[PDB]
Amino acid sequence: GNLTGKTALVTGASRGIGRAIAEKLGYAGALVAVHYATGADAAAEVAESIEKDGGRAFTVKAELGVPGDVDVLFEGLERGLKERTGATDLDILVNNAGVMAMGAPEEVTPEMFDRMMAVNAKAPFFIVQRALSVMPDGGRIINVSSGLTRVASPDQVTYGMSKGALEQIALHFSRHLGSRRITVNSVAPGSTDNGSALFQIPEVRETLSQLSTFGEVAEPAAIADVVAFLASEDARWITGAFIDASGGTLLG
Amino acid sequence: GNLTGKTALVTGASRGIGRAIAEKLGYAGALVAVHYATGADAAAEVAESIEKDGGRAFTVKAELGVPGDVDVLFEGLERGLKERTGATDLDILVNNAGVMAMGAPEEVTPEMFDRMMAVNAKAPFFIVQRALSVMPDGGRIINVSSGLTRVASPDQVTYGMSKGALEQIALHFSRHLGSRRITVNSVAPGSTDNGSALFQIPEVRETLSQLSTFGEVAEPAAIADVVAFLASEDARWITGAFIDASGGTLLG
Amino acid sequence: HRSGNLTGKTALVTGASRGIGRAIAEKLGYAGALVAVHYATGADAAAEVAESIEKDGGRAFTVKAELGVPGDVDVLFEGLERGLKERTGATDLDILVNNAGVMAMGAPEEVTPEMFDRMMAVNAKAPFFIVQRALSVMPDGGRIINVSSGLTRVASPDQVTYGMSKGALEQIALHFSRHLGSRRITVNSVAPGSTDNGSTLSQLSTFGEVAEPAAIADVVAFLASEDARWITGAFIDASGGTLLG
Amino acid sequence: HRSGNLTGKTALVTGASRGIGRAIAEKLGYAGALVAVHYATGADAAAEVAESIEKDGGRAFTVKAELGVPGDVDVLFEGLERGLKERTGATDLDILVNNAGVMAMGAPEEVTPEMFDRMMAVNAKAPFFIVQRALSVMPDGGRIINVSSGLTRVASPDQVTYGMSKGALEQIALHFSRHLGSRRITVNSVAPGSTDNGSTLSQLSTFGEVAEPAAIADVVAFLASEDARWITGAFIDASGGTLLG
Ligand SMILES: NC(=O)c1ccc[n+]([C@@H]2O[C@H](COP(=O)([O-])OP(=O)(O)OC[C@H]3O[C@@H](n4cnc5c(N)ncnc54)[C@H](OP(=O)(O)O)[C@@H]3O)[C@@H](O)[C@H]2O)c1
Ligand SMILES: NC(=O)c1ccc[n+]([C@@H]2O[C@H](COP(=O)([O-])OP(=O)(O)OC[C@H]3O[C@@H](n4cnc5c(N)ncnc54)[C@H](OP(=O)(O)O)[C@@H]3O)[C@@H](O)[C@H]2O)c1
Ligand SMILES: NC(=O)c1ccc[n+]([C@@H]2O[C@H](COP(=O)([O-])OP(=O)(O)OC[C@H]3O[C@@H](n4cnc5c(N)ncnc54)[C@H](OP(=O)(O)O)[C@@H]3O)[C@@H](O)[C@H]2O)c1
Ligand SMILES: NC(=O)c1ccc[n+]([C@@H]2O[C@H](COP(=O)([O-])OP(=O)(O)OC[C@H]3O[C@@H](n4cnc5c(N)ncnc54)[C@H](OP(=O)(O)O)[C@@H]3O)[C@@H](O)[C@H]2O)c1
Ligand SMILES: C[C@]1(O)CC(=O)c2c(cc(O)c3c2C(=O)c2cccc(O)c2C3=O)C1
Ligand SMILES: C[C@]1(O)CC(=O)c2c(cc(O)c3c2C(=O)c2cccc(O)c2C3=O)C1
Ligand SMILES: C[C@]1(O)CC(=O)c2c(cc(O)c3c2C(=O)c2cccc(O)c2C3=O)C1
Ligand SMILES: C[C@]1(O)CC(=O)c2c(cc(O)c3c2C(=O)c2cccc(O)c2C3=O)C1
Secondary structure: OOOOOEEEOOOOOOOHHHHHHHHHHHHHOOOOEEEEEHHHHHHHHHHHHHHHHEEEEEEEEEEOOOOOHHHHHHHHHHHHHHHHHHHOOOOOOEEOOOOOOOOOOOEEEOOHHHHHHHHHHHHHHHHHHHOOOOEEEEEEEEEOOOOOHOOOOOHHHHHHHHHHHHHHHHHHHHHOOOHHEEHHHEEEOOOOOOOOOHHHOOHHHHHHHOOOOOOOOOOOHHHHHHHHHHHHHOOOOOOOOEEEEEOOOOOO | OOOOOOOEOOOOOHHHHHHHHHHHHHHHEEEEEEEEEEHHHHHHHHHHHHHHHHEEEEEEOOOOOOOHHHHHHHHHHHHHHHHHHHHOOOOEEEOOOOEEEEEEHHHHOOOHHHHHHHHHHHHHHHHHHHHOOOOOOOOEEEEEHHHHHHHHHHHHHHHHHHHHHHHHHHHHHHOOOOHHEEEEEEEEOOOOOOOOHHHOOHHHHHHHHHHOOOOOOOOOOHHHHHHHHHOOOHHOOOOOOOEEOOOOOOOO | OOOOOOOOOEEEEOOOOOEEEEEEEEEEEEOEEEEEEEOOOOOOHHHHHHHHHHHHOOOEEEEEEEOOOHHHHHHHHHHHHHHHHHHHHOOOEEEEEEOOOOOOOHHHHHHHHHHHHHHHHHHHHHHHHHHHHHHHHOOOOOOEEEEOOOOOOOOOOOOOOOOOHHHHHHHHHHHHHHHOOOOEEEEEEEEOOOOOOOHEEEEEEEEOHHHHHHHHHHHHHHHHHHHHHOOOOOOEEEEEEEEEE | OOOOOOOOOEEOOOOOOHHHHHHHHHHHHHHOOOEEEEEEOHHHHHHHHHHHHHHHOEEEEEEEEOOOOOOOOHHHHHHHHHHHHHHHOOOOOEEEEOOOOOOOOHHHHHHHHHHHHHOOOHHHHHHHHHHHHHOOOOOOOOEEEEOOOOHHOOOHHHHHHHHHHHHHHHHHHHHHHHHHHHHHHHHEEEEOOEEOOOOOOOOOOOOOOOHHHHHHHHHHHHOOOHHHHHOOOOOOEEOOOOOOO
């Protein structure tokens, strides 16, 4: 219970890595806002499983990448935190929600690009901007990046660009927020089983396993344990940092 | 005349670093498309000075960051290259055009963000995408980044994000384009006198000089000489690389 | 006997008599590891640490070895393998923390070949051979952590040899992580910024303080735990935002 | 006498008898620099390079020095400072290229303390002291370039000591660039990928070839020219897209 008394927002917490992060933070004693876009039943399962194991949670619906998305998010977040704790204080922020798309660089449209950049970099920036008014000293901001910012992959170039824009938040905000003692950091998972049918195809799973020096794709729990650490007092002297959680995928 | 027979596009070539790059490429014997948005007289001065010194140039008007911008750009580029050389071949691409904005991270609007990302990352990506159909083997793509991708500066965070998205192009496209022997690279200038009134204020110029290990802001020619090198056969074994041209500003 | 997440594991922390190494030792011991507290000549300090760990219910002992002299690794592992047998009946080493090291300022014009050999001998060479030797006694799931320095990222003319040595050290995490990947040994570098070991520099951290050794120990303890199982070959910045340009 | 952009400058290229160093020498000489072609024991190769440069209208001579043994730097600068006086009447050294180095594969379990000392002695130590000594005879606007390796970026277990040495070398560009900034000496690292020096590896470059020594020389010649005046402290990737993950 090292996060006892703390509050946390995890975006994209209805499934995958975000679900795992939400479960781990919850288990550590934080009140967790489990955020989602359209996965309402899934978000409620994640919220229940935190409570089931002795913690505290609720869900917040906000479709990111459209106008007024952050407003919707923080209206639901701050209301939920008020009614439950008596304040709007947000101690921990995990920008996890993300979209992925594969395709030849030749076939990328401007619509695809805007969507990618809107969800993966723009929303996170404005979520941080909005979080600054309600985040107490000693707060934590963690952005879930991708190892593809260090590994060339033409089929994922626009995704890559969007994550490279995301990583800049940690660098520039950690300087802004130093005297508030708010740490801002990027976690880069490698290929991670997010429970979607793609990781069931044995040939595809073989290929992705090869990329880690461990010979496996990651379980979401493995990323979640790194995020839990960054959220704790134990990671207080880490800020503006790129954390390689790819299982040795970035070895060249 | 080591670029004799080559063709080149420099975006944002009406002034500043782009003007300098255009002048240096021209001098080396390349036909240069001097690109601009609204600086028509300035672009024509740059085109004349290349001709004046014995080279070949024309200007192309394209306002970037709006729909159909790339179409406008490449309709003018390819027509100009056809009428002058008999082909639409583009040997060299310099994504230079850029917008800069300073302000507290708290005061950034979504409009400001879209503009920043649209001009500084999106346009460059689609310019590259469009350039691939007309670029011969042995071609060159050079993106002008910024040292602020390695130096925290809260007042320039959105600018930073946009350049971090830009740097990803070199990483992912250099893998895509390896077998065509097209090199893709990022140049990061530090603070550079772009001939704008800001570098006239002696207190501001003092501050910016301090940041280089040389104790000076850069002349645009100094960046241009690096770009000329990357454009040549001499830089043929450099691809997917981040070139620090900041005059020792990135030393920590 | 106080139980925690490292209950069952053995650990070697080089240079655990004072400073960062002491904090790492205290921290790993507190998490349940049996901790070999290594030292060159601070036996009194080392015993005080070993005693500190055993008082709070952990388990520890001290090992004497001067590093960067011929025979250094032999003497070190003689004492360690002995202590571990005594206490466990096995030579198994689950956790290796290469923390011991030397620091020296001075104009780069005045650096001598002797000064150079000293720096490399302690800061890079001994760490390599300590790792080489540990492989024979390290079980799968083990942990190797090399305490580097943020000075490999920040230019400091008066500390060029020291930087050189730490840059050589950082390469151990890169190349070994590939080597040990199938044996599940994670190999990482942790880079502290300015830290009050006890002996202007505060202006370097974004926080405007020098670190306390506990702030650094907390990162090392993390890397040593199962929670850090998917981090290997990494450079972990623990400088408190000193590498921000 | 064939004139170019380095007309007026003197240069030292360590290990210029064969391989990358030969290409650098030929290239700097062709650009007008008076080139000291250094070697350990390949005097025939070195003369052939020196002759090659003088035939094409440049200027050169050879210098004998075994590196990584006591006295190495003295012997080196004895020969250089002599050659330069003879030809110019001054000891001025405008350009220093630390290219000489040793390579060795082998299981990391079989690396010996002797093998380690050899690697560091040649690849990092001598380069440091060659730089230290050159400062006394290098005019403002000078150039220092250290030939590193992309192996500092790509994990290779069988080349851990070599990587270590090059990582130590890379630190020279970081710390000296700050030191020399006001004297306008640029200090850079250039990192080749797999290069055919003449003695599967092709699959590493995005181009699917091993480099020719000329491809690397072309980057070094650039760094040595005024065109590279605003690049210092940099790591220059010349691996032909080998560091792409
Ligand atoms: N999976 C990997 O291999 C991998 C590797 C490296 C990094 N990452 C990063 O890790 C993060 C999580 O990805 P994942 O694979 O674990 O999950 P995956 O199933 O996509 O799940 C994505 C989550 O983000 C939410 N989301 C998507 N678009 C949204 C939007 N426009 N507005 C609000 N929420 C939105 C989804 O909510 P709903 O359920 O409501 O649709 C869902 O909870 C992403 O940032 C991804 O880039 C993933
Ligand atoms: N200056 C520095 O200190 C510095 C440092 C590091 C990196 N950089 C980068 O270097 C590049 C050049 O900047 P600078 O300071 O030299 O020039 P600065 O005067 O802004 O000039 C910018 C150029 O980009 C063009 N441009 C701007 N917006 C455009 C748009 N929306 N569509 C088409 N063209 C547009 C401008 O054309 P018009 O004349 O038609 O308006 C102008 O030629 C930028 O990418 C900048 O980020 C600059
Ligand atoms: N201090 C900083 O600001 C800072 C910042 C970044 C990184 N670091 C690194 O953090 C590590 C610990 O730093 P520290 O400041 O805590 O150092 P410290 O206070 O000087 O203590 C160094 C430890 O190393 C041992 N040691 C020194 N030379 C040795 C040798 N030749 N053979 C065996 N042991 C030797 C000492 O043992 P004895 O008690 O017997 O002498 C002592 O336990 C070092 O590697 C240092 O490079 C320090
Ligand atoms: N080859 C690659 O694929 C590759 C890739 C990346 C980086 N590099 C680096 O590129 C540089 C040159 O590589 P290369 O492949 O061209 O090497 P090379 O073919 O083996 O030649 C090495 C040069 O170093 C000299 N040398 C060796 N040991 C010496 C010593 N102890 N003292 C003085 N000189 C010594 C040799 O002189 P003698 O003729 O008298 O023996 C020779 O001129 C090296 O630093 C290497 O690490 C090479
Ligand atoms: C889950 C997925 O559909 C599969 C995938 O292709 C991927 C995706 C997102 C990612 O961030 C990565 C990867 C990835 O492999 C992959 C492989 C190797 C290293 C990586 O960092 C990654 C990724 O970061 C989208
Ligand atoms: C020309 C300007 O109005 C002035 C400026 O603030 C700046 C601008 C753009 C930049 O890319 C940089 C810098 C910069 O200082 C500066 C200072 C120190 C290191 C840098 O890389 C930079 C920049 O890259 C906008
Ligand atoms: C304790 C000390 O005498 C002080 C010091 O100079 C230092 C020392 C060791 C270090 O590892 C660092 C630094 C350091 O400043 C310093 C300043 C700014 C960033 C750093 O990473 C460091 C260091 O890593 C030796
Ligand atoms: C000539 C050689 O015996 C071959 C070799 O193993 C190598 C050698 C020196 C090097 O610097 C490299 C490499 C290298 O592959 C290699 C493979 C992939 C990336 C690299 O940067 C490298 C190297 O830098 C020694």
